Amino acid sequence: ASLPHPKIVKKHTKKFKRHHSDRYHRVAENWRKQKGIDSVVRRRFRGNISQPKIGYGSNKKTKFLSPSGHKTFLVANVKDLETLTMHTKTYAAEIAHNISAKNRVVILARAKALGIKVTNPKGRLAL
Amino acid sequence: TAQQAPKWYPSEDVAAPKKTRKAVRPQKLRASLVPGTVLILLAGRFRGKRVVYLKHLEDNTLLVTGPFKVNGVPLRRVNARYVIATSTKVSVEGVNVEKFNVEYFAKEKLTKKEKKEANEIKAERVEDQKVVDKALIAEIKKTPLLKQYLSASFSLKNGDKPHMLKF
Amino acid sequence: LRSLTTVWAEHLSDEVKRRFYKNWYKSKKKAFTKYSAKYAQDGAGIER
Amino acid sequence: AESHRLYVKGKHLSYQRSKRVNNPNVSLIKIEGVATPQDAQFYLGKRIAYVYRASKEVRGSKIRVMWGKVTRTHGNSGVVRATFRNNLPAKTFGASVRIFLYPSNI
Amino acid sequence: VAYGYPSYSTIRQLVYKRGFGKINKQRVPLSDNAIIEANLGKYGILSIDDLIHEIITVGPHFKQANNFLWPFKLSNPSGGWGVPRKFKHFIQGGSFGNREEFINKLVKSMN
Amino acid sequence: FNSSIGRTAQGKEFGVTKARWPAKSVKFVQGLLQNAAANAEAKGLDATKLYVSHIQVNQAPKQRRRTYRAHGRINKYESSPSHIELVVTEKEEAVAKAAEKKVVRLTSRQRGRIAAQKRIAA
Amino acid sequence: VEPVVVIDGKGHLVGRLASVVAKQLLNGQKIVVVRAEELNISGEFFRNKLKYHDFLRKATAFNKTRGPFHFRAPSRIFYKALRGMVSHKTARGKAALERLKVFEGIPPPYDKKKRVVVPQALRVLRLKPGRKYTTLGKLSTSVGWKYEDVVAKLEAKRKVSSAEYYAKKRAFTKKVASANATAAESDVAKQLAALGY
RNA sequence: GAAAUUGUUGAAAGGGAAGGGCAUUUGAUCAGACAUGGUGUUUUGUA
RNA sequence: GAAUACUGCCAGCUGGGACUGAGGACUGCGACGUAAGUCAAGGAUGCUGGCAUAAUGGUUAUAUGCCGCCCGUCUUGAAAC
RNA sequence: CCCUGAAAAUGGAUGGCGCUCAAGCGUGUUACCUAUACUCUACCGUCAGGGUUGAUAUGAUGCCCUGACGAGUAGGCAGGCGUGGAGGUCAGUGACGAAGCCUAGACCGUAAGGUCGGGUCGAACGGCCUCUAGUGCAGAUCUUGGUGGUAGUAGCAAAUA
RNA sequence: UUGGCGGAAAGGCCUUGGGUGCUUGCUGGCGAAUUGCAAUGUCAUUUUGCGUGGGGAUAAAUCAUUUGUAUACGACUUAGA
Ligand SMILES: [Mg+2]
Ligand SMILES: [Mg+2]
Ligand SMILES: [Mg+2]
Ligand SMILES: [Mg+2]
Ligand SMILES: [Mg+2]
Ligand SMILES: [Mg+2]
Ligand SMILES: [Mg+2]
Ligand SMILES: [Mg+2]
Ligand SMILES: [Mg+2]
Ligand SMILES: [Mg+2]
Ligand SMILES: [Mg+2]
Ligand SMILES: [Mg+2]
Ligand SMILES: [Mg+2]
Ligand SMILES: [Mg+2]
Ligand SMILES: [Mg+2]
Ligand SMILES: [Mg+2]
Ligand SMILES: [Mg+2]
Ligand SMILES: [Mg+2]
Ligand SMILES: [Mg+2]
Ligand SMILES: [Mg+2]
Ligand SMILES: [Mg+2]
Ligand SMILES: [Mg+2]
Ligand SMILES: [Mg+2]
Ligand SMILES: [Mg+2]
Ligand SMILES: [Mg+2]
Ligand SMILES: [Mg+2]
Ligand SMILES: [Mg+2]
Ligand SMILES: [Mg+2]
Ligand SMILES: [Mg+2]
Ligand SMILES: [Mg+2]
Ligand SMILES: [Mg+2]
Ligand SMILES: [Mg+2]
């Protein structure tokens, strides 16, 4: 149902993990660059982790595309959803986490009427 | 609001493709494949069965008969890339293969709603095979041991080298 | 060198078979009983 | 017939490799009865199936197949390079593999 | 560098396969006689063969013709360099030097 | 927790060489076993097929005192109390069987193979 | 090409044979080697004896029980010469070594199976005439192998019994040759001769 | 009511470390695509 | 009096294998034909089959092949005893 | 070429194995293996040179065409991610559950990070344009607080019982 | 089913008689299809459990006590219906 697009290519699926995040607990996994003088990671020795850099940039025609083929958009109320009336083929709505269950019902009902795809049509559903 | 807005939206209109310049022309099939040669099936249900080649069909395929009376391979369609053309030649003049075409074989795929696990043949396919092969076997019966040769199944042994083998 | 077979005597004294038990006092003392049954025929299982 | 084999036997030797670096995307295959590249030149383009057995049931069988083709010869002894849809698990070094006769050329 | 005297065939292969002009400080493939017309029409050059003729026969406008061509980007030889070791003179069985007329064999491999 | 302790022949039952007789722990444990059994009796359990289904021990807050070392230095001297909890349960017979039906999807060529095999056989 | 391969070690070179064998193990071919006491080593006997003695001296200083073990059996000497030829510290190597069995003399059932030789590792086809060579069995006893006499005894028994097998085999094949000779000069044979059989 | 640290339960591996990088096997686990408009009324609530 | 070897040229013909299909109404350069028009001419199309489900794929654990020294710092030089 | 000349301390190193018309030495001819190198293609970014006000529809700091290039400590510059608080806006979210916390569950970005599902939770919080700073931690024998291995270990032995 | 040989890891080899299915040594008759143009198209062995109905036999070790040819504790050596 989405707009046709070329094949999705990422060139790197593995998340870039901070060096020694697996060794010391206080070293969080969020990527920081190693600024050490004799750090093998900074010197790019063979057999070590690969640093993030611009060469891994994804295709512009593919950037920000969900595997379904849409661009994710965050919606908070009914009025917000109407901004996607004419852009169903490119954008998909997604209810914010802080939306009440009752307000989620009216959001999903409106989206179905207008054919707007919803990425998470299961949040806070009582069944 | 949660996410403010995108200032520009991509166009919803789909664009037409460019004028492709890839025309279609028939194959230049290998000279070893001659109507009336004996072939070997390298794949499928009837793999390894020595068979006879009849006609080059329009959808890049070869019309093939067993004969069905000898070994049990009926009138069937194959692809030239999965068979081996032997040096044995069968004179196939005097048989009407022009009746057979790409539309002569259809599958009539069933609807996905109807799914069967318990489980037939067309009468015309039976008689078409019966007419053709009985005309052929009048010719196979000339060369000695070839009738048994078609009934046999091809198989590699120890020591054989296909790069040095002859067919 | 490897041992291939062992041939025992038909009867064993009480003291010798006590070597085969770590607790002789609470035991059925069934040492070589079925091996004794290998005897009572002339030479079938032994002379062979 | 007592023999139903329609493929030639092969042994997966190793990945493409230097002393210290190997490339799993390319595999080296030894074909029985081939000792020179000229003979191996006939075997290019053929299909290669690796047949292994698995405990869990998938889709009607215990047998799962790795499909691949040869690409070019290798060395002066008739070894050839082969690539697969998914690279061989590197545990199959020396495992027997099947090389078929299609797409045929004769 | 390894250098020698090229043949008519070798220069023909180079310009046809790897022929690039320096148009407005850009490396534009030739691929058509019109490009040569626009940039080399002043010096009587109209076709790609005109460029070849000015090259093999060193003409009055060889400097402009040669400088117009972008430097050739060649691959490693297909059959190899033919010698175990390169960086000694060709007379020593090496690679560099003035291999006077054997360069035709090399450049064809190089292209 | 058995580093640098002695050995005993009574550990052969458990295939181990290091065993002890912690009377203080044993007294507390069996105290809870009596309490649990009494609770089981109140709930109306048969008191004959019960087994210790769950039991765990985890650390409790320390109780610190002071010890006196050489050269007028002070070191910690505390206890290691425990929270002990256990659940008894009646032993049951075989639980259940008849797991999922294991639905299967067959290819068209697999379908023909079974049909041919069933046709040539009975 | 074969389930297992039985190599007759007599007249071979320990180094050249090992390289041939080692590659076969890495390729997945099961190998068993018999009569390891007739492997030959290029060089004179005293030359190789000194080499082994120099190998003896190398041991762990502080504990000789964990140093390089100096095996003395002819098969084991070959095994060490082969073990260093394979990356034995990897799981691939360990599986590779597991496919190999080195034997002294010709043991049971492998005695009833056909043995093969490696032409490129044979002494006669590799050594220039006039060069001196050694016999592994002689060397092994000079450095501590104890069982030279028993293997010589058993191989004497094995060779004797094998003689009647061939004597029966040769006599039977003579009948086959006579029958085939009579069966020739027939129509059936003529096509085989015509078709090359 | 987080982390260091610990207990129980469950899964997995373990021949003088463990941890990591590339690729894949195996196991476990996970999303989407499968209505499209349409021929069309073999139709019910007749549009 | 020829042949053949070696070297070089062909805007000579042809078989086999591998990877890539980027771009997206037309425009340009061409070629084939008297023309219509066609074409391998400024980037792939056509026919057919299976599945539509964890099948492909992602994540994670493990195994295998190969590689992989502990970080920060001073220093010409750090894994540093 | 080889041998004598040629003696040092843990056991030992043409890298190891091993290698005698060699797997050694001198020389020649090919074939073959492979680097983040060279040739070609795709994509990312940067730089440079160009086209495009015309109505309609968005972004003229927008879109598009072509070529070349991409290592890097100390250092310089630019574009961005995030935190506390301030002005403005979304008549934003929220007791039908905000914030916070856990999650080998999912999505997006090369990344800083952003979003959702699921469990606990009970009272406030966010998106965008700007303003402002006591704004981002692994190290400093850092400060305070808490917790480990060592480890049920050293040990609890002067003063007769 | 008859007997012989084989102890290096024998665990196999040879042999008697009869019965049995097949035999493409040679000549005949029928079936094959639809798995639809290929998708290993599944045919081997490794172990264990649970059921059958058919044979077969009804132990020991450790703790505890004891000994001292032993000993830090373990361990060893003893003894006890
Ligand atoms: Mg950490
Ligand atoms: Mg440095
Ligand atoms: Mg090459
Ligand atoms: Mg070189
Ligand atoms: Mg200890
Ligand atoms: Mg102590
Ligand atoms: Mg004190
Ligand atoms: Mg004091
Ligand atoms: Mg509380
Ligand atoms: Mg914790
Ligand atoms: Mg240990
Ligand atoms: Mg020539
Ligand atoms: Mg999966
Ligand atoms: Mg996959
Ligand atoms: Mg996986
Ligand atoms: Mg891991
Ligand atoms: Mg390493
Ligand atoms: Mg210094
Ligand atoms: Mg040091
Ligand atoms: Mg000297
Ligand atoms: Mg070497
Ligand atoms: Mg040489
Ligand atoms: Mg490469
Ligand atoms: Mg966690
Ligand atoms: Mg909440
Ligand atoms: Mg309150
Ligand atoms: Mg500060
Ligand atoms: Mg800190
Ligand atoms: Mg720091
Ligand atoms: Mg500190
Ligand atoms: Mg103590
Ligand atoms: Mg004291």
Chains F and D: 3 or more CB pairs within 8 Å of each other? yes
Q: Which amino acid is at C10?
A: E
How far is Cα of residue A117 from the mean position of the Cα atoms in its chain?
Answer: 16
Residues sharing a CB contact under 8 Å with residue D37, sequence separation 6 or more, in sequence order: D73, D75, D76, D78
Is the distance between the Cβ of G85 and the closest atom of strand J smaller than 7 Å?
Answer: yes
- Angstrom distance (rounded) from CA G104 to CA G70: 18
From the list G4, G28, G13, G44, the residue with the least C-alpha distance to G125 is G13
CA F4 → C1' J153, Å?
A: 7
Query: How is residue C43 written in tokens?
Result: 């030479």
- Judge whether G103 and G110 are in contact, CB under 8 Å: yes
Helix, coil or strand: residue E22 = strand
Query: How is residue G169 written in tokens?
Result: 């085999």
From the list D99, D76, D9, D12, the residue with the least C-alpha distance to G27 is D12
Q: How many other C-beta atoms lie within 10 A of the C-beta of residue G37?
A: 28
- Angstrom distance (rounded) from CA F49 to CA E10: 98
D103 prior amide bond cis, ω within 30: yes
Q: What share of chain B is helix, strand, coil (3-state, %, to 5)?
A: 15, 15, 65
Query: At what angle are helices E33-40 and E48-56 packed, to 10 degrees?
Result: 60
- Angstrom distance (rounded) from CA F26 to CA F37: 16
Residue A16, class by beta-carbon neighbours within 10 Å (0-12 exposed, 13-18 middle, 19+ buried)?
Answer: middle
Question: Own/partner pairs for E5-10, CB < 8 Å, 24+ apart?
Answer: E5/E100, E5/E101, E5/E103, E6/E103, E6/E104, E6/E107, E7/E101, E7/E104, E8/E52, E8/E56, E9/E104, E10/E103, E10/E104, E10/E107, E10/E108
Nearest nucleotide (C1') to alpha carbon of A119: J116
CA B140 → C1' K27, Å?
A: 17
For chain C, what is the radius of gyration of the CA atoms? 13
Query: How is residue E49 written in tokens?
Result: 């063969």
- Judge whether D106 and B81 are in contact, CB under 8 Å: no
- Strand partners of residue B69: none
**Which residues are placed with Cβ below 5 angstroms of ligand 4, an ion?**
E 84
Q: How many other C-beta atoms lie within 10 A of the C-beta of residue G61?
A: 6
Which secondary-structure segment (H or E) carries E50?
helix E48-56
Q: Which amino acid is at G24?
A: Q
The upper half-sphere exposure of residue F89, i.e. CA atoms within 13 Å in the direction of its Cβ, equals 9
From the list C27, C33, C30, the residue with the least C-alpha distance to C10 is C33
- Angstrom distance (rounded) from CA G3 to CA B112: 49
Q: Which amino acid is at G188?
A: V
Which secondary-structure segment (H or E) carries E2?
strand E2-3
Chain G residues with CB inside 8 Å of D31's CB?
none
CA atoms E40, E44, E47, E49: torsion sign: negative
Instruction: Write the DSSP symbol of residue B93.
Output: T
Chain D residues with CB inside 8 Å of G1's CB?
9, 32
Which secondary-structure segment (H or E) carries E33?
helix E33-40
- Judge whether B40 and B154 are in contact, CB under 8 Å: yes
Residue G134, class by beta-carbon neighbours within 10 Å (0-12 exposed, 13-18 middle, 19+ buried)?
Answer: buried
Question: Is beta strand E2-3 parallel, antiparallel or unpaired with respect to D96-100?
Answer: unpaired
| C-beta atoms of D59 and F102 within 8 A | no
Q: Which amino acid is at F65?
A: R
Ramachandran sector of residue D75 (left: φ over 0; alpha: ψ -120 to 50; beta: rest): left
Instruction: Write the DSSP symbol of residue A49.
Output: P
**DSSP per-residue letters across B45-82:** TTTTBEEEEEEE-SSS-EEEE--TTTTS--SEEE-GGG
Q: How far apart are the first and last CA of chain A?
A: 28
> What number of residues does chain E have?
111
Which secondary-structure segment (H or E) carries B39?
strand B37-41
Residues sharing a CB contact under 8 Å with residue B53, sequence separation 6 or more, in sequence order: B33, B34, B35, B36, B37, B38, B39, B62, B63, B64, B83, B85
Question: Own/partner pairs for B150-153, CB < 8 Å, 24+ apart?
Answer: B150/B38, B150/B50, B150/B51, B150/B52, B150/B66, B150/B67, B150/B70, B150/B71, B151/B70, B151/B71, B152/B50, B152/D1, B153/B48, B153/B49, B153/B50, B153/D1, B153/D4
Q: Give start and end residues of each alpha helix (H) in chain B.
A: 123-140, 146-151
| C-beta atoms of A87 and B5 within 8 A | no
Instruction: Write the DSSP symbol of residue E19.
Output: -
- Angstrom distance (rounded) from CA A108 to CA A99: 12
Is the distance between the Cβ of A41 and the closest atom of strand H smaller than 7 Å?
Answer: no
- Angstrom distance (rounded) from CA B165 to CA D8: 13
- Angstrom distance (rounded) from CA F109 to CA B106: 17
Ramachandran sector of residue G91 (left: φ over 0; alpha: ψ -120 to 50; beta: rest): alpha
Helix, coil or strand: residue E96 = strand
Instruction: Write the DSSP symbol of residue F54.
Output: E
Residues sharing a CB contact under 8 Å with residue A56, sequence separation 6 or more, in sequence order: A11, A12
| C-beta atoms of D11 and G26 within 8 A | no
Distance D72 CA to ligand 4 centre (A): 23
Q: Which residue has the tokens 């009440």?
A: A100
| C-beta atoms of D60 and F104 within 8 A | yes
- Angstrom distance (rounded) from CA D18 to CA D26: 13
Query: How is residue G186 written in tokens?
Result: 């027939």
Phi, psi of E50 (to 5 degrees): -60, -40
Helix, coil or strand: residue A118 = strand
Is the distance between the Cβ of G55 and the closest atom of strand J smaller than 7 Å?
Answer: yes
- Strand partners of residue G100: G31
- Angstrom distance (rounded) from CA E18 to CA F55: 81
Secondary structure, 3-state, chain G: CCCEEEEECCCEEHHHHHHHHHHHHHCCCEEEEECHHHCEEECCHHHHHHHHHHHHHCCCCCCHHHCCCCCCCHHHHHHHHHHCCCCCCCHHHHHHHHCEEECCCCCCCCCCCCCECCHHHEHHHHCCCCCCEEEHHHHHHHCCCCCHHHHHHHHHHHHHHHHHHHHHHHHHHHHHHHHHHHHCCCHHHHHHHHHCC
Chains G and F: 3 or more CB pairs within 8 Å of each other? no
Helix, coil or strand: residue A40 = coil
Q: Which residue has the tokens 């091996």?
A: C35
Q: How far is CA B109 from CA A80, B126, F67, G101, in A?
A: 46, 21, 90, 59
- Angstrom distance (rounded) from CA B144 to CA B15: 66
- Angstrom distance (rounded) from CA G22 to CA G65: 28
Residue B51, class by beta-carbon neighbours within 10 Å (0-12 exposed, 13-18 middle, 19+ buried)?
Answer: buried
Phi, psi of G43 (to 5 degrees): 115, 165
Q: How far apart are the first and last CA of chain D?
A: 24
Is the distance between the Cβ of F9 and the closest atom of strand K smaller than 7 Å?
Answer: yes
Nearest-5° Cα angle at G143, G137 to G148: 35
- Angstrom distance (rounded) from CA G123 to CA D79: 29
Q: How far is CA E77 from CA B154, D69, G61, G174, in A?
A: 46, 28, 57, 64
Query: At what angle are helices G14-26 and G74-83 packed, to 10 degrees?
Result: 60
Chain G residue whose CA is closest to D32: G1
Secondary structure, 3-state, chain D: CCCCCCEEEEEEEEEEECCCCEEEEEEEEEECCCCCHHHHHHHCCCEEEEEEECCCCCCCCCEEEEEEEEEEEECCCCEEEEEECCCCCCCCCCCEEEEECCCCCC
For chain D, what is the radius of gyration of the CA atoms? 14
Residues sharing a CB contact under 8 Å with residue D102, sequence separation 6 or more, in sequence order: B42, B43, B81, B82, D46, D47
From the list B86, B100, B89, the residue with the least C-alpha distance to B139 is B89
Helix, coil or strand: residue A75 = strand
- Angstrom distance (rounded) from CA B162 to CA B156: 9
Query: How is residue G171 written in tokens?
Result: 């006599």
Cβ-based contacts (< 7 Å) between F 62-121 and strand K: 107-113, 115-116, 119
From the list G38, G7, G43, the residue with the least C-alpha distance to G136 is G38
Is the distance between the Cβ of F48 and the closest atom of strand H smaller than 7 Å?
Answer: no
Give yes or no for A89 touching B (CB within 8 A). yes
CA E44 → C1' I34, Å?
A: 36
Q: How far is CA F108 from CA B79, F12, G132, in A?
A: 20, 62, 71
Phi, psi of A109 (to 5 degrees): -60, -45
- Judge whether F63 and F87 are in contact, CB under 8 Å: no
Q: How far is CA F102 from CA D59, F98, F105, F106, in A?
A: 11, 11, 10, 13
